[PDB]
Amino acid sequence: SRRILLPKNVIVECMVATNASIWLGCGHTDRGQLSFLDLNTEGYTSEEVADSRILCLALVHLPVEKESWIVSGTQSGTLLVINTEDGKKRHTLEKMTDSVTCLYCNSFQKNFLLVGTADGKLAIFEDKTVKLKGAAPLKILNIGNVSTPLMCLSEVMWGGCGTKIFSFSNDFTIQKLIETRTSQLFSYAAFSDSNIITVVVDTALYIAKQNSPVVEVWDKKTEKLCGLIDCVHFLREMSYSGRVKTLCLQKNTALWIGTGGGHILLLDLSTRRLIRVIYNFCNSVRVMMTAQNVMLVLGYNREIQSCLTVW
Amino acid sequence: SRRILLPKNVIVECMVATHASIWLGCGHTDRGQLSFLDLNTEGYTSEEVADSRILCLALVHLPVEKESWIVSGTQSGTLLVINTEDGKKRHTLEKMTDSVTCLYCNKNFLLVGTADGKLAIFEDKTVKLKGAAPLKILNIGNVSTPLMCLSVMWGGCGTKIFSFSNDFTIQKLIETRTSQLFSYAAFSDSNIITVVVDTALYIAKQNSPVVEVWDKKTEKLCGLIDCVHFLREMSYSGRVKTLCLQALWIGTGGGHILLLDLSTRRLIRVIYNFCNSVRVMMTAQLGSLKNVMLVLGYNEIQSCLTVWDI
């Protein structure tokens, strides 16, 4: 477990891992700046590659043809594809009608690039088609509207659009559509009327909402509330907001929760709840993800100092 | 609405009103101290009447024979009955096997819940007889599940809600620990301290900021009210101490009082820092057509009784 300090005032919007290194989208700038961080040497390099802020990143790897492409989704809707080995090899896919708010690589075996936009749409690209300039998506799913951003995808595929959880499979048709805005069992109603920010898929669906300390648990079959995890009460065992910022699952049993503060919770998902709790791990946990085995946690302190902890 | 300051360092464990004045059990003392407060003159008098702390009060009124008796249940299990008009008329009913933790007036009956999970029933008249035995004793729980609230009659024993109507059968027996799946597990694993019955059951648990709402028929959770989250619209504990129906009043461990709607579970009113700690909140009839709201709080201790009309 070591901490890697990023250059001062660097803000990280998005992050993807691959001498291990990571690609970063920068949020301290209104244009599209792509950064590269060597985890072994802690070296940081960046380049302006697009006209609008890079919101989300995805790494498309082609085992045949031996090529890795880094895909940047931007605030203007542009999908910029850049070659990992030769930066002079870069092009743009079809422009989205709104900002790109989600990038996921799925596999069905066929691999795909799923592109969620801010106007509630989900564009699907095939593995190979990412190499082609001006490439069009195989299909576009109109799941929401301009007011329901599609912000998270997890793996059948589950996703969050506004206050709705959606599911889709091979044919890319929306099978399950679950409205989470209403439930009589809600400990508090105002938290549940927020956009879903993250979805982790285990035996049940564990979702988090914007500016909400309550992780909701919904059932895949019955499409109803399974349970509630109130981070405020777990933290208090006292002025913590408990606002959930990120969810990360372990091998099978454990769930990491990064809160608005620097607090990280580790709960068991089988018969009890609380395993571990680290207070003031940073000032604010922003991103938490697994990579290949390894745990990456991006937090920031505030001038702004972003840090990447890894164990 | 007017507030009456009790003498300094007086602690009120239990409370019952009559017509206006109130009877108080004192908690600042290890023996059984009964106090009397005139709501018109704010005059306070007290007397040591028992050997152990008076935990509960009940006022048995007999319309025929025209007699009012004040019954005190104590920490040793003693049930002391005293005449309202003549204090020299006092006696003791059958000793309970453990401390008396609940006294309710319900043909009229006196229900006596104890700390070892038992409920003794006395008839209206039998309260006048020295050493009188109860009509029946229901063993609902055990030494570890005290019976602490009564409100058909519903009651709370440990983490279980029980029901009974004609005194010889426990009708409903509902385990409320099952709500571990929602909001918080440690809060739901606590003894029920108060129960209010309107259409669903609104229960509160010891050291819990979550008022649970259960269904009478399906015997399952209807909803949850988290006082911490309602108060935050910041270090408030939100620990519920008292529930009252009017709308639902909630007095918290702090000095905070919430007034929520039932049909819609929406927030009507919120009074912050009403005192340092709300302890009791109840309705009383101070005379003919006189419905009144009494709130006992405390603030080195200063207990106060706020009183307003409904």
Author numbering:
A (entry chain A): 2141 to 2158, 2164 to 2253, 2259 to 2305, 2314 to 2395, 2408 to 2462, 2468 to 2477, 2488 to 2496
B (entry chain B): 2141 to 2159, 2165 to 2251, 2260 to 2304, 2314 to 2395, 2408 to 2420, 2424 to 2476, 2488 to 2498
Sentences from the paper on this structure:
LRRK2 is a large multidomain protein with 2,527 amino acids (286 kDa) and consists of armadillo repeats (ARM), ankyrin repeats (ANK), leucine-rich repeats (LRR), Ras of complex (ROC), C-terminal of ROC (COR), kinase domain (KD), and the Trp-Asp-40 (WD40) domain. The C-terminal WD40 domain of LRRK2 is required for LRRK2-induced neurotoxicity and has been shown to mediate the interaction of LRRK2 with microtubules and synaptic vesicles. The structure reveals a canonical seven-bladed WD40 fold and a surprising dimeric state in the crystal. We found that the WD40 domain forms dynamic dimers in solution, and both structure-based mutations and PD-associated disease variants in the WD40 domain mainly impair its dimerization.
Here, we report the crystal structure of human LRRK2 WD40 domain determined at 2.6-Å resolution. We determined the WD40 domain crystal structure using the single wavelength anomalous diffraction (SAD) method and refined it to 2.6-Å resolution. The ordered part of the structure extends from residue 2,142 to residue 2,498 and has a few gaps, and the last 30 residues in the construct are disordered. The first six blades run from β2–β5, β6–β9, β10–β13, β14–β17, β18–β21, and β22–β25 continuously, and the last and seventh blade contains β26–β28 and β1 from the N-terminal end to complete the fold, forming a stabilized ring-like structure. There are two WD40 domain monomers in the crystallographic asymmetric unit, which are related by an almost perfect twofold axis (176.3°). The interactions are centered at blade V but also involve the surrounding structures as well as blade IV and VI. The dimerization interface is large and buries approximately ∼1,200 Å2 surface area per monomer. In addition to surface area burial, a number of potential hydrogen bonding and salt bridge interactions exist, among D2388 of one subunit and H2391 and S2345 of the symmetric subunit, among R2394 of one subunit and main chain atoms of M2408 and Y2410 of the symmetric subunit, and between E2395 of one subunit and Y2346 of the symmetric subunit. Notably, the WD40 domain mutation G2385R is located at the dimerization interface and compromised dimerization. Therefore, the WD40 domain dimer observed in the crystal is also a bona fide dimer in solution, instead of a crystallization artifact.
